[PDB]
Ligand binder design. Structure first.
Ligand SMILES: N#C[Se-]
Ligand SMILES: [Cu+2]
Ligand SMILES: [Cu+2]
Ligand SMILES: [Cu+2]
Ligand SMILES: [Cu+2]
Ligand SMILES: [Cu+2]
Ligand SMILES: [Cu+2]
Ligand SMILES: [Cu+2]
Ligand code: NA
Ligand SMILES: [Se]
Lengths: 466, 471
């Protein structure tokens, strides 16, 4: 009695790319036909702990004929944080960064940029606005780098360290401290860094949502637990020049000048705190930020497509969407707080607002509402002119990332079952803000992207927000 | 006017009723259950998370559950060793994991739980077809590198019987080792290790270093498959069950024979010979208390997929490559399989080349139609043949996509659900066909290399058209 053709025909020709987290795979699906075009399983290549984590794809003149993307993995004890009763004793080290190319037929594993450069980074991957480079951060090592895609080389890498005012773990961020940013230099032959695999870790796994409390309460193992800032992502100003490096635990977004590779200002997420803190150069490769206190952690961070707003989602101790007027492209030290999105139903850690996507016209922003089991996770729909919550919709357990078709007609999200229960791809019509359907997905995905065609598409892909 | 309005998927899924589709992923290393009523994947498990470093998740069968949404159980097995190297994935792994695990998995209404590894306990590492017994209380696994099969008790996870099958070729030259006939020996095995354990863990016992891939039976003849006992292979595939009980048929790809076993005294009783123009059957000769022989003057063609119809009165065996057809026997004589005779053969002019191979199947519960996949190597689209299972006449053939494997059917008979698998590298999907109109109603995405799929049954009557009666 009913065929699926009319459901798929509504979407136009877009390709959804997903990593699978504990499944270990990456896959591209054709939204016009329902077919999985291609997939790749990391363990087939001898990666024994292929926790396929974050990714971003580059503009392709015709994604159907071919496209390329970066996907990274985590490793070590990250295998142990989702309650899977595995007896594995010595997990694969992980922290790979894979370049993958779809050739119209299959995926090709082109290179391991982590092996090539020495930097093993496991958290967010983002494409630069020109589609010619990409960044990866890691929140266990607190390093990030920007890479040149053509030469697979490091343009810059930085370490970020916390020196707490109070050495007591419970009080290590609340009572403030000094954040030190160091521009790194390779230490090994051939210009290679020494951070492959688990090397450089301050803590033995990435913090989960609300994890900051777990860290403070001594539930996370590691050799440098009070020196962690939990770098998350380096998201890009669509107008060029600037990138914002999110630091979860101090709740700061450090803005970098990508032309001379120095930090220029620190935005402070918490409501009631100043717009920003100055960055002080104290040696030729070293800068500091002094914080008397840290009111709350923050996590999701991103620019609107026009680059004139920057968002940072405060979580745990405060719970809201902080908005800065970044319309002055010349000078980020003048970026200032302009609005905060709040709701009576949003307090403390959950929901955690931890991924977003804007409409291409910048009218609305869709934001994930994450909770631990068993509260239903969903999508919040925010008016992004007036900065007000419009609507919330329940989807399924453990909601992760949101992408948008480049015509702005459909949001496409993924939920991931905490790596063990229900999972799926969800598609929401941006006119009605109603779910039109869910497709099956064998994935624990913490990411998803729609393969972009132009640099303009990146403005609402994995470049400007995570 | 092509984009006049939004469409919701609800009506599409509502038509299927409450059925749960399970799939293994071959090179993806996963198993997953999908709720056809909502589109949601209820749960999945990735073998590598548990320390299985070569989880080639190959075949599975599920047991009847009074409410699959609240819980069910299934068996899925794996291959291992150099099987990782045979689908053109350019991995540089040097020493792949041993594999050949047989995992018992239970869905608890929320997640899958790995309950046990039957292969570790019994010492039988077997990596080809898994089939549920008709009572839903046991299962069989066969392996086509080691040429062994066993039936297991589910409750005790113990081995009820295991047999080796070996080939002694009349002509010792690989190229003619089957064509010119030979003797097949069937041996009832006895465990050799303490704890009543067999000595066939991992790759141990393999005659060839990797499986004969779909369509690839004759690669061994051509010198393309390495191994220590190359010309002694029969490539056992499946033990499929008579739904009337007592009998099971053991398929042996390279001799193109199905050996009928009596499950009540564990002895083979007759060998059905697949090839068109050859006799319906050959006798089995007992030559020692634990040993039987079948003698063949020639082997005309290999064969692969096999099954009984739901009523048990027809048995099908698919000849492939040197002939592509569906061979059908009249099995209506439940008392004596030595009287089972060929009664029809489905052929088609479009099937005269090397490919397509008539491949996996599923019958309608009422027995009136059987659906049979049509396999080809890249790049020809694979499809589904709709066969009239009363007159034994091809009715229709529909193109689906690359590397089509198994078919399942909702148990009210209304939809066939199949999987295609991209040769572990290109397009993959779940395909759903309406059995009233025999049209494809849609494809859903699938991250899978699946060579199997089942819909979780509620009763032993449902097993008559699940992974029990046919592959
Ligand atoms: N039997 C198989 Se693919
Ligand atoms: Cu993040
Ligand atoms: Cu996420
Ligand atoms: Cu994540
Ligand atoms: Cu139109
Ligand atoms: Cu088979
Ligand atoms: Cu198959
Ligand atoms: Cu197979
Ligand atoms: Na190491
Ligand atoms: Se995430």
């Amino acid at each position: 009695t009913t065929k699926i053709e009319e459901f798929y025909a509504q979407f136009g020709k877009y390709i959804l790319l997903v990593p699978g987290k504990f499944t270990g795979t990456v896959a591209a699906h054709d939204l016009s036909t329902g077919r999985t075009l291609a997939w790749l399983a990391g363990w087939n290549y001898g990666d024994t702990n292929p926790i396929m984590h974050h990714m971003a794809a580059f503009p392709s003149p015709d994604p159907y004929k071919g496209f390329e993307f970066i996907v990274n993995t985590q490793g070590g004890k990250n295998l142990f944080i989702y309650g899977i009763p595995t007896t594995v004793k010595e997990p694969g080290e992980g922290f790979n960064i894979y370049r993958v190319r779809y050739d119209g037929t299959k995926f090709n594993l082109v290179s391991n940029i982590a092996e090539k450069t020495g930097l093993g980074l496991g958290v967010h991957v983002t494409a630069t606005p020109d589609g010619k480079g990409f960044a990866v951060a890691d929140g266990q090592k607190d390093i990030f780098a920007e890479f040149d895609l053509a030469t697979e080389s490091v343009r810059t890498a930085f370490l970020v360290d916390w020196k707490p005012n109070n050495s007591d773990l419970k009080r290590a961020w609340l009572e403030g401290g000094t954040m030190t940013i160091t521009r790194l230099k390779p230490t090994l032959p051939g210009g290679k860094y020494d951070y492959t695999g688990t090397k450089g870790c301050k803590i033995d796994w990435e913090l989960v949502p609300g994890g900051e409390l777990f860290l403070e309460e001594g539930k996370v193992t590691g050799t440098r637990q009070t020196n962690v800032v939990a770098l998350d992502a380096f998201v890009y100003d669509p107008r060029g020049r600037w990138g914002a490096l999110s630091a979860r635990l101090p709740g700061v977004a450090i803005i970098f000048d990508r032309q001379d590779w120095e930090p220029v200002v620190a935005l402070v997420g918490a409501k009631g705190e100043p717009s920003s803190l100055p960055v002080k150069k104290v040696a030729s490769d070293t800068w500091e930020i002094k914080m008397d206190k840290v009111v709350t952690p923050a996590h999701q961070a991103g620019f609107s497509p026009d680059g004139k707003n920057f968002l940072f989602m405060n979580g745990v101790r405060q719970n809201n969407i902080m908005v800065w007027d970044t319309s002055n492209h010349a000078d980020p030290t003048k970026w200032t707080k302009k609005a905060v999105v709040e709701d009576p139903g949003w307090r403390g850690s959950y929901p955690n607002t931890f991924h977003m996507v804007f409409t291409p016209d910048g009218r609305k922003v869709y934001v994930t509402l994450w909770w631990p089991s068993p509260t239903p996770n969903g999508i919040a729909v925010v008016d992004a002119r007036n900065w007000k919550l419009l609507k919330s919709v329940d989807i399924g357990p453990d909601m992760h990332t949101l992408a948008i078709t480049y015509d702005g007609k459909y949001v496409v999200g993924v939920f991931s079952g905490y790596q063990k229960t229900a999972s799926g791809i969800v598609i929401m019509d941006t006119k009605s803000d109603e779910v039109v359907g869910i497709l099956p997905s064998v994935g624990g995905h913490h990411d998803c992207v729609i393969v972009p065609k132009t640099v303009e598409d990146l403005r609402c892909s994995r470049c400007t927000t995570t």
